[PDB]
SAKe6BE-L3 (synthetic construct), 320 residues
Amino acid sequence: GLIYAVGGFATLETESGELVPTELNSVEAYDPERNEWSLVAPLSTRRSGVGVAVLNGLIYAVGGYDGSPDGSTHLNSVEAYDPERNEWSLVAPLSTRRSGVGVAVLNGLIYAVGGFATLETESGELVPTELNSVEAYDPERNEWSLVAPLSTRRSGVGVAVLNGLIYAVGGYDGSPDGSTHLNSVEAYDPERNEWSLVAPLSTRRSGVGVAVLNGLIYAVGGFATLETESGELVPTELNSVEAYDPERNEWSLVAPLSTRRSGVGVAVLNGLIYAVGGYDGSPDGSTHLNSVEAYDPERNEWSLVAPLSTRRSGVGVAVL
């Protein structure tokens, strides 16, 4: 019955007044009855672009990014939060490091979908790699195993479960060739161990937050390079929200966010979608967001609720 905001990144002022890039280990919990965020136990490992999902009463924080000049940049480590003990434990790491990984839970397994890493070639060269690999975590065995890969390599992908399928929505591909911001959507059938294509988003979006409510998938916010009427390509944080109906295999627009944002954490609690934090790369205004919006599907409206105590982009969000 609480929303947990896990990790993320912000530029924060020191006591001496210097602004420093900070990957976050802090975790905040939102109580909707009180409309308040409160700190809980922090992650062991500071991380942003982390995938977060709930399984068997525990929150799992999977992979992520650490831009510090020391140490690994792309993480394979996985932490598990016990709310009764208010403690984070380490579990088995991913086989492949991945930042900007999407995670969802289906049939008692955690799926880690896509992401990005710098990986060594056979010749020893380090190359930037968007990932198509998908790993599944069995908590009874404390083991990750490979399942079928995505058709399309992608990071910053939104992942959610609907009607026994995992949907991988949008994302980012930094290759020098081809589209950088994705509208494509894939669906994973665990019985067949197969990914299929479904209807694409109307607007391409990387760093999109995805949640399922009342039988629809909502794709919330994100970022894309979009052509203006004059033909110029401009970087655009998105406020648009699209809803996917699996019976019709169609996306439709619903009410937009008040605040354009990417790298936003999205989760469902008590029949509302919460959009938590995120990133705004505009040359004006705050870059890392503490604001939180709540979507009512009956009224088709987004409202503001209490903001996070610490701004955070690339935050993972789950409900427990």
